[PDB]
């Protein structure tokens, strides 16, 4: 009969620390993705941004998104998922009034890479030894007629048109420029030349080399 109201950081500091490691990250407004885009793991990330926009007091703290996944395309090349699952991710992440600080640990294979540039400009954090890859997506095993391959070609037509619209807003290029540079062939990007291209801006905050700390001593 009483309402189950949630508690936040100005209120739940007297109730102790959270017991489990995803619940420490949920209190710190940090979402760590260590799994590719499965239908089981996409339901929790929708409820996570729904919880962060549920009863937040200020609604202005930046949400840190750490991504480490293959997206929907595995290392062998086939599609373990489809590209329509990413449309539920960007529509739910960009709904909140809070800015989206995006970071990458190791890899972002053709679905997490377009989410890497989709964050707030001026705060794209990245590790200095990560790998970034932008390739056009593929489809799973579909057995149909001649008109069935045409409608599947229209689904990948909207995939390249939606992915280039995100890269045109991030990198500041045209619509046809991002299709020729990124979404044509399976290429890879390092950390240094991606800053000149416009994928990332800086490194992670508080980064310092252990050898550079010995030079200060």
Footprint on this chain of another protein (rule: CB under 8 A): 1-5, 39, 42-43, 46, 50, 53-55, 77-78, 82, 84-85, 87-88, 90-92, 95, 136, 138-139, 141-160, 162
| Number of neighbours of residue 211 by Cβ within 10 angstroms | 7
User: Please, how many CA atoms are within 13 Å of residue 130, restricted to the half-sphere of its CB?
Assistant: 27
Is the sign of the CA dihedral 188, 64, 98, 24 positive or negative?
positive
CA distance linking residue 168 with residue 177, whole number of Å: 8
CB-wise, 160 or 195, nearer to another protein?
Answer: 160
Q: Based on CB atoms, which residue is closest to another protein, 40 or 210?
A: 40
In the complex, the smallest distance separating the C-beta of residue 144 from another protein, rounded to whole angstroms, is: 7
Least Å distance between CB 14 and another protein? 20
Nearer to another protein, 160 or 181 (CB): 160
CB of 77 to another protein, least distance (A): 7
Residue 16 in 3-state DSSP?
Answer: coil
Whole-number minimum distance, CB 191 to another protein, in Å? 21
Give the count of alpha carbons within 13 A of 134, CB side only. Answer: 23
Report the alpha-carbon distance of residue 142 to residue 149 in Å, rounded.
8
Dig out the tokens for 13 from the structure: 């500091």
Q: Considering the complex, state which of residue 25 and residue 138 has its C-beta at the smaller distance from another protein.
A: 138
Q: Could you tell me the CA-to-CA distances from 195 to 103, 123, 126, 171, 199 in Å, in that order?
A: 14, 12, 10, 10, 6
Q: How far is the CB of 156 from another protein (least distance, A)?
A: 4
Nearer CB in complex with another protein: 153/204: 153
């Amino acid at each position: 009969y009483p309402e189950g109201r949630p508690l936040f950081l100005p209120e739940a500091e007297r109730f102790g620390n959270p017991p489990d490691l995803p619940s420490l990250l949920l209190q710190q407004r940090v979402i760590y993705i260590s799994m590719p885009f499965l239908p089981s793991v996409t339901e929790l990330v929708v409820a996570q941004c729904y919880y962060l926009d549920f009863d937040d007091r200020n609604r202005q703290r930046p949400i840190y998104v750490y991504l480490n996944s293959t997206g929907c395309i595995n290392d062998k090349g086939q599609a373990i998922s489809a590209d329509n699952e990413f449309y539920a991710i960007w529509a739910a992440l960009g709904f909140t009034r809070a800015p989206l600080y995006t970071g990458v640990t190791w890899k972002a294979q053709n679905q997490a890479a377009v989410l890497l540039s989709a964050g707030q400009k001026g705060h794209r954090y990245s590790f200095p030894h990560a790998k970034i890859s932008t390739a056009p997506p593929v489809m799973n095993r579909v057995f149909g007629q001649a008109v069935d391959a045409q409608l599947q070609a229209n689904e990948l037509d909207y995939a390249t048109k939606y992915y280039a619209a995100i890269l045109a807003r991030s990198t500041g290029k045209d619509l046809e420029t991002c299709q020729k540079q990124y979404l044509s062939r399976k290429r890879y990007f390092s950390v240094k030349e991606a800053y000149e291209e416009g994928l990332v801006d800086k490194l992670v905050p508080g980064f310092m080399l252990n050898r550079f700390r010995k030079m200060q001593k």
